């Protein structure tokens, strides 16, 4: 498999490329940047190759700054952007416009924030099928919520299944109705009352801003999440993950929006959107999140 | 960690010892048999050591036929017996009686059938704490039910959590109320109606007899299951697994019986018994299974 | 990839199939036996599927008793035979004769003893390329010799590279000239004088007889070795292993014989035979072993 | 085990900590920086915990800016310094002076360049045993040289054993006399003549400058190397690696210097220094490198 990383000079692009070459299913990683940063990509290329030697893993690292260098990749990772919607939306247009004409079987993974809005932009400008364009969305938010619950019940992480749907932002929605420990609904689990869901969600929603103001931004957490998504797709693992995808009325008839939703992912991208049944309160928060994401998408498309 | 395998000359003992030495957490495996089969254990010792060399793994393989050779082990696996209750119950008495006096921190894993009944016998004769004596029970039955459901929904196996409680036999009880795919109750999952639970359970309950009449008995399936249980305990993984354990009124006030139940397992054995809430029908089948196991336990203890 | 195991009903066939289905690169394992053992193979199929469920791994297990069931396999493992040369030579002819006509891209690995002689038989009757027919040979013997050396120097096993070439029998030849620890020739390694080469070779060459008279035969060591060889080929790993291969004058001009030699192995079978340079004594032992293997092969071919 | 990283705010400290927490043998990672960078370390702690959640791995991440926060660690990694010898020598003294008084069983790995010189400084100021203070040295340089050789012969990387001893700089010395492929001396290996040793050494020694002028510095290669060394020590793997260690006359009677040499590494640090035998030319280059490292170390000690 060949994976291109656009924005490899950045904090997220460099880290994600380094850990992506360690995957056995990734035979080639192509580093893409603007023409004025190709020299920087040469240094990163040797750095990554040195790390592969240390790990006794193999991968071909290439560099490019043109459309022909990454359009034929199996998976294209979009990590380039300013760390709002207006500026990053143009960058998506520059790189992904018309990709379907050349490689109609491409899969695009969008990391640039706003991830939900820019997934819609990428799908529209690219012309690819709706199942082949996705974004990281709330995947990492769901994973960290999973750890918090597991520690509360003092169980192995694999025992906890949970999810955060909606926008990768303040309008995210934890789905308690579909949270389980060992298959047991968490509501019926002893000790659930002592778990402060509201406090835990606040940790999830605010950790992004705290990391930015102190460290500068997320590099390792997001890069590992991208590794999870790419490995799942390229190995056709068919896991139900929470990614930003185009809704076409599978959940409450809500359609024409890209937002974090449960999706069974494989080599063909989004095989299907799981039609989860939400409770009253969860549905109300989900609808509020969808309305917020749709208005932002309106602004982005106008800027394009 | 040191693990002793009593009955290493048999189909289950030999296979389980071979795969147990491959675990990184298993530094020594002691092969225990009757004095008239020590010579056979010498051949098996070199065979296993040859396999470790092929796998580039390390482990010390010892042999013994006396109490002093295995009483100080961290985990003792009881695979010796005829492949009913009366004959195998005496064998449990011979090897495990009084083990608490010498090593009170021992953990006993019982595989000899009837596993549920013989777990009670082993706990009584050994004098160990009720949390340090367990049996394989319905762990493998739950794992195979897990695979059948995963293939039905065409999802990764890790997405499916399910369980079979009760006797390792005809009175086993699948717990649909605590079965989930991605955290979603399977009842709310689209396509659940097309899954034939009754047919699938019949496959689980009868595969044992079909294997016996054709191949002779289970060797690889059960041996791998034992590897799962021992790895979980020695690495303190704290997974919720289905093993035969002593109930003391955690489920519906049913007490004084050993039967397959959900249990969080760690280095200390059964940390706790998950107090699952069952539905009407599931509770009725569970009570029928408990009554059957209790009568069999009555016969066994009398024989001792 | 699909791997067929002829003789799956046996000790070596059953065990090798069980561990081969655990490899991620093996998607299907076909169990082949004589027609009067199909029912036994049904039980072995259910047992192995139980182990896969316990290990959370996936593979399709098929059953067959006809040529059409295994001729299209990528790798065919020959474990069927009496546990000599005359009787087993006929068995090889029955199964492998003309295989090139149907699947010319097949790879045959021969385990039935005499392994070197029957590797020659399989190549002749099959009509396959000389690089697509090999045998286990001295791979496991070299592996155990490697462990003994590593323990002597108290170093990690990966640090020791060594090999035993020639017949898988009494005429095997350890190659000290090409034995190294960390890249340092073992002769120059401190403590090499305290290593009793004669004692170590005695343990390796006789362990087969010791195991047979007590346990019955080699089961786990050989099964793991088959897993090693098949994984190496199917993943095109290009490791230098000691397998029985057809010599065409790469070592001292010796040709027209199958015997254990260093060979770089990949998806195309034997990519090349390493032209090792032997010392005087080592070469004389190699010629003695070749003489024994050639005479035995002549007798086998006469039996047809 | 607990591993402390001094300089976690830097490119090497942050990256090394992120990959060190992924090791199963590392239960705690402590991030150490100057007091004015504690807030930045808080963000790095949250980011790394996010990566652990994504990777389904567990580890406790702590923060500190005082000696008491890291003196009781099992392994202390020194990545703090200006990216020469005079300024960095003071930094080493501040952190490691007197560490033996509090935790005499600590192991110090020095990464700050000049690595060889500062390894000597750390050993002197700490008062620790000569076997408990080491440096990264030429481990990564040897690893990349190993990959280049493997690609030339088109063999698996595990088949190549090689090392570069001496200074981690322009006076490094490749040891062809102790380079082997599959146990065969590389000089006797077919195709060795087509290998341009001078070209390969040029790539290894200069890649550091090439990376610095474009990317800024080494980040991923060195971070992975630290993970390699720490895992080797904490799991008592007994691998022969090339690290900066105190020579006491094991190689040509050269003593009173820290420089890259083959060393068998375990939980006790440097178990022993392999007394490699060098050829005429290789030994002369080794003496030249020792002369350079000794003069630089003299200058450093004067700076205190
Ligand atoms: N999923 C999440 O929650 C997270 C998402 N992100 C998103 O990733 C994006 C960048 O993150 P980060 O990499 O940390 O920011 P950086 O500034 O560190 O990296 C910026 C990248 O974008 C490229 N770039 C900037 N402007 C342009 C342009 N006009 N045309 C083409 N390429 C351009 C840069 O190339 P050059 O080297 O030439 O500048 C560089 O590769 C942001 O949108 C951020 O929100 C990041 C972290 C967390
Ligand atoms: N969990 C499950 O569902 C399964 C459980 N099992 C149970 O495992 C047990 C044996 O399985 P298997 O190993 O296939 O049967 P085998 O007969 O193949 O192995 C029998 C073992 O028991 C030992 N043994 C027999 N009689 C005595 C005795 N009187 N005193 C001491 N040791 C004795 C044998 O030693 P010697 O070599 O001297 O005979 C041998 O080690 C049975 O109880 C069977 O039900 C097995 C498969 C599946
Ligand atoms: N290092 C090595 O290379 C080693 C190789 N081996 C070899 O492995 C082979 C099998 O060992 P093992 O499996 O223990 O012996 P088993 O008798 O236990 O297994 C015999 C297998 O051969 C099959 N078989 C027997 N006779 C015939 C026949 N006439 N035609 C076709 N198939 C037949 C049987 O099938 P059914 O049940 O239908 O008869 C069964 O699957 C032996 O040749 C042995 O030498 C073993 C150890 C070391
Ligand atoms: N193969 C090898 O051995 C290699 C080693 N290295 C070495 O790694 C070291 C760091 O490289 P890098 O991390 O990229 O450089 P950075 O400047 O990116 O990181 C510098 C680190 O040093 C700390 N630091 C700087 N000045 C002082 C001081 N006066 N007292 C205490 N701590 C201080 C900083 O902490 P703060 O943010 O608080 O200042 C920061 O954590 C360098 O010495 C470099 O030579 C690098 C490449 C190869
Ligand atoms: Cl998710
Ligand atoms: Cl279970
Ligand atoms: Cl096995
Ligand atoms: Cl080999
Ligand atoms: Cl990283
Ligand atoms: Cl090294
Ligand atoms: K790779
Ligand atoms: K082990
Ligand atoms: K498989
Ligand atoms: K860890």
3-state secondary structure A47-94: HHHHHHHHHCCCCEEEEECCHHHCCCCCEEEECCCCCCHHHHHHHHHH
Cβ–Cβ under 8 Å, residues A40 and A12: no
Nearest to D6 by CA among D84, D94, D86, D87: D94
Report the C-alpha gap between D179 and B78 in whole angstroms. 50
Residue to mutate among B182, B237, B266, B282, with most A CBs inside 10 A, is B182
Nearest to A77 by CA among A120, A109, A118, A99: A109
D135 SS3 class:
strand
Task: Using CA atoms of A233, A239, A241, A245 in order, give the dihedral in degrees to the nearest 10.
Answer: 50
Rounded to the nearest 5 degrees, what angle is found at the Cα of A275, between the Cα atoms of A273 and A279?
135
End-to-end CA, chain A:
32
CB of D202 less than 8 A from some CB of A: no
Residue A170 burial (CB count, 10 A): 10
Residues composing chain A: 304
Report the C-alpha gap between B234 and A38 in whole angstroms. 51
- The answer to whether the CB of D81 is under 6 A from ligand 4 is yes
Nearest to C57 by CA among C13, C16, C26, C32: C26
D194, two tokens: 């087509």
D185, two tokens: 């001396």
Report the C-alpha gap between D257 and D246 in whole angstroms. 6
**Phi–psi pair at D166, nearest 5 degrees:** 95, -155
Instruction: Write the residue in B51, B216, B225 that is nearest to C54 by C-beta.
Output: B225
CA-to-CA separations, D58 to B40, B264, D4, D8, in angstroms, rounded: 43, 18, 17, 19
Per the listing, tokens 């290894």 go with: D204
End-to-end CA, chain C:
32
DSSP letters for D28-62 = EEEEE--GGGHHHHHHHHHHHHHHHHHHT---EEE
Nearest to A120 by CA among A84, A95, A152, A93: A93
C16 SS3 class:
helix
Residues whose CB is less than 8 angstroms from the CB of residue B69 and which lie 6 or more positions away in sequence, other chains included: B4, B30, B32, B62, B63
**Phi–psi pair at B120, nearest 5 degrees:** -60, -45
For chain D, where are the alpha helices, taking DSSP H only?
Answer: 11-20, 38-55, 85-96, 99-102, 115-126, 139-153, 197-214, 220-234, 280-303
Confirm whether residue B7 is marked as ligand binding: yes
Which sequence positions of A are flagged as catalytic? Answer: 168
**Phi–psi pair at C77, nearest 5 degrees:** -105, 125
Which residues are near ligand 12, the ion (C-beta closer than 5 Å)?
Answer: B 26, 59
Residues whose CB is less than 8 angstroms from the CB of residue D61 and which lie 6 or more positions away in sequence, other chains included: D21, D28, D29, D30, D31, D45, D48, D49
Rounded to the nearest 5 degrees, what angle is found at the Cα of B104, between the Cα atoms of B101 and B110?
100
Report the C-alpha gap between D110 and D124 in whole angstroms. 13
Q: Is the dihedral of CA B203, B207, B210, B214 positive or negative?
A: positive
**Which residue CA neighbors atom 40 of ligand 3 most closely?**
C10
Per the listing, tokens 């990694």 go with: D77
Report the C-alpha gap between B110 and B5 in whole angstroms. 10
CA-to-CA separations, B234 to A147, A216, B52, D297, in angstroms, rounded: 22, 41, 20, 48
CA-to-CA separations, B253 to A295, B283, B287, C13, C55, in angstroms, rounded: 55, 12, 11, 49, 34
B227, two tokens: 């590897």
A43, two tokens: 């240094």
Report the C-alpha gap between C209 and C213 in whole angstroms. 6
CA within 13 Å, CB half, A125: 21
Active site (annotated) includes residue D168: yes
D181 SS3 class:
strand
Instruction: Write the residue in D48, D49, D207 that is nearest to A46 by C-beta.
Output: D207
Give span(s): CATH 3.40.50.720, chain A: 2-135
Nearest to B12 by CA among B134, B89, B95, B111: B111
DSSP state of B156: -
Cβ–Cβ under 8 Å, residues B121 and B104: no
**Phi–psi pair at D168, nearest 5 degrees:** -75, 75
C112 SS3 class:
coil
Report the C-alpha gap between A254 and C268 in whole angstroms. 53
Task: Using CA atoms of D96, D99, D104, D109 in order, give the dihedral in degrees to the nearest 10.
Answer: -20
Report the C-alpha gap between A63 and A54 in whole angstroms. 21
Report the C-alpha gap between A134 and A269 in whole angstroms. 8
Strands, sheet with D184-185, edge to edge from the N-terminal-most edge strand: D160-161, D180-181, D184-185
Residues whose CB is less than 8 angstroms from the CB of residue C239 and which lie 6 or more positions away in sequence, other chains included: C232, C264, C265, D155, D156, D158, D159
For D97-138, where are the alpha helices, taking DSSP H only?
Answer: 99-102, 115-126
Nearest to C179 by CA among C203, C148, C202: C148
Chain B residues whose beta carbon lies within 8 Å of the beta carbon of residue A161:
159, 161, 180, 182-183
C176, two tokens: 């000290």
Rounded (10°) angle between helices C139-153 and C197-214: 130
Residue A25 burial (CB count, 10 A): 14
Q: Based on C-alpha coordinates, what's the Rg of chain C?
A: 19
With DSSP H G I counted as helix, E B as strand and the rest as coil, what are the percentages for chain C, rounded to 5? 50, 20, 30
Pocket residue to mutate for ligand 1, from A12, A43, A63, A138, most atoms within 8 A of Cβ: A12
Residue B68 burial (CB count, 10 A): 8
CA within 13 Å, CB half, D269: 24
Residue A90 burial (CB count, 10 A): 14
Alpha carbon of A162: minimum distance to chain B alpha carbons (Å): 6
Residues whose CB is less than 8 angstroms from the CB of residue C290 and which lie 6 or more positions away in sequence, other chains included: C166, C254, C257, C259
Rounded to the nearest 5 degrees, what angle is found at the Cα of D156, between the Cα atoms of D152 and D160?
70
Report the C-alpha gap between B272 and B292 in whole angstroms. 24
**Phi–psi pair at B277, nearest 5 degrees:** -100, 120
Chain B, residues 272-291, CB within 8 A of chain A, namely: 274-277
Resolution of the experimental structure, in angstroms: 2.4
At the topology level of CATH, where does B2-135 sit? Rossmann fold (3.40.50)
Cβ–Cβ under 8 Å, residues B260 and B164: yes
Residues composing chain D: 304
Pocket of ligand 3 (CB under 6 A): C 7, 9-13, 33-34, 37, 79-83, 91, 111-113, 115, 136, 140, 168, 217-218, 222
Q: Is the dihedral of CA D84, D87, D92, D95 positive or negative?
A: negative
At the topology level of CATH, where does C139-303 sit? L-2-Hydroxyisocaproate Dehydrogenase; Chain A, domain 2 (3.90.110)
Cβ–Cβ under 8 Å, residues B107 and B166: no
**Which residue CA neighbors atom 11 of ligand 1 most closely?**
A83
C75 SS3 class:
strand
Cβ–Cβ under 8 Å, residues C232 and C241: yes
**Phi–psi pair at A263, nearest 5 degrees:** -145, 135
Report the C-alpha gap between B204 and B172 in whole angstroms. 10
Residues whose CB is less than 8 angstroms from the CB of residue C224 and which lie 6 or more positions away in sequence, other chains included: B50, B51, B54, B55, C19
Report the C-alpha gap between C207 and C193 in whole angstroms. 24
Helix (H) or strand (E) holding C8: none
B301, two tokens: 């203890």
Report the C-alpha gap between C284 and C291 in whole angstroms. 11
Per the listing, tokens 């990216």 go with: D83
Nearest to C13 by CA among C215, C218, C242, C214: C218
DSSP state of D155: -
Pairing of strands B164-165, B107-110: unpaired
Report the C-alpha gap between A42 and A47 in whole angstroms. 9
Report the C-alpha gap between B20 and B54 in whole angstroms. 15
Strands, sheet with A180-181, edge to edge from the N-terminal-most edge strand: A160-161, A180-181, A184-185
Cis peptide before B114 (omega within 30 of 0): yes
Give span(s): CATH 3.90.110.10, chain D: 139-303
Cβ–Cβ under 8 Å, residues B289 and B172: yes
**Which residue CA neighbors atom 7 of ligand 4 most closely?**
D112
DSSP β-bridge partners for residue A297 = none
A205, two tokens: 């929603």
CA-to-CA separations, A241 to A191, B159, B190, in angstroms, rounded: 27, 10, 17
Pairing of strands B107-110, B75-78: parallel
Pairing of strands B184-185, B180-181: antiparallel
What counts of helices (H) and strands (E) characterise chain D?
9, 14
Nearest to D21 by CA among D65, D51, D66, D64: D51
Q: Based on C-alpha coordinates, what's the Rg of chain A?
A: 19
Ligand 6 centre distance from Cα of residue C51 (Å): 14
Method: X-ray
Rounded (10°) angle between helices B11-20 and B38-55: 40
């Amino acid at each position: 498999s060949k994976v291109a990383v656009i924005g490899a000079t950045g904090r997220v692009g460099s880290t994600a490329a380094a850990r992506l070459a360690l995957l056995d299913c990734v035979n080639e990683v192509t580093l893409i940047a603007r023409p004025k940063s190709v020299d920087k990509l040469r240094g990163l290329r040797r750095d990554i190759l040195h790390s592969l030697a240390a790990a006794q893993k193999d991968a071909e690292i290439t560099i490019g700054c043109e459309r022909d260098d990454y359009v034929d990749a199996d998976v294209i990772v979009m990590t380039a952007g300013i760390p709002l919607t207006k500026d990053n939306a143009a960058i998506i247009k520059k790189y992904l416009e018309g990709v379907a004409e050349e490689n109609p079987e491409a899969i695009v993974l969008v990391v640039t924030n706003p991830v939900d809005v820019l997934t819609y932009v990428a799908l529209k400008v690219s012309g690819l099928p709706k199942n082949r364009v996705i974004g990281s969305g709330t995947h990492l938010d769901s994973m960290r919520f999973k750890v918090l619950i597991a520690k509360h019940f003092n169980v192995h992480m694999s025992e906890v299944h949970t999810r955060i749907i909606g926008e990768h932002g303040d309008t995210m929605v934890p789905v308690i109705s579909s949270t389980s420990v060992g298959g047991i609904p968490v509501t019926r689990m002893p000790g659930w009352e002592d778990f402060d869901v509201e406090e835990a969600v606040r940790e999830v929603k605010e950790a992004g801003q705290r990391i930015i103001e102190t460290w500068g931004g997320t590099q390792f957490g997001i890069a590992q999440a991208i590794t999870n998504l790419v490995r799942t797709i390229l190995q056709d693992e068919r896991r139900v993950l929470t990614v930003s995808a185009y809704l076409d009325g599978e959940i409450d008839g809500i359609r024409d929006v890209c937002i974090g939703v449960p999706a069974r992912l494989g080599r063909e991208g989004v095989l299907e959107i799981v039609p989860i049944e939400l409770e009253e309160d969860e549905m109300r928060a989900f609808r509020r999140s969808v309305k917020v994401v749709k208005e932002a998408t309106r602004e982005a498309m106008e800027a394009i």
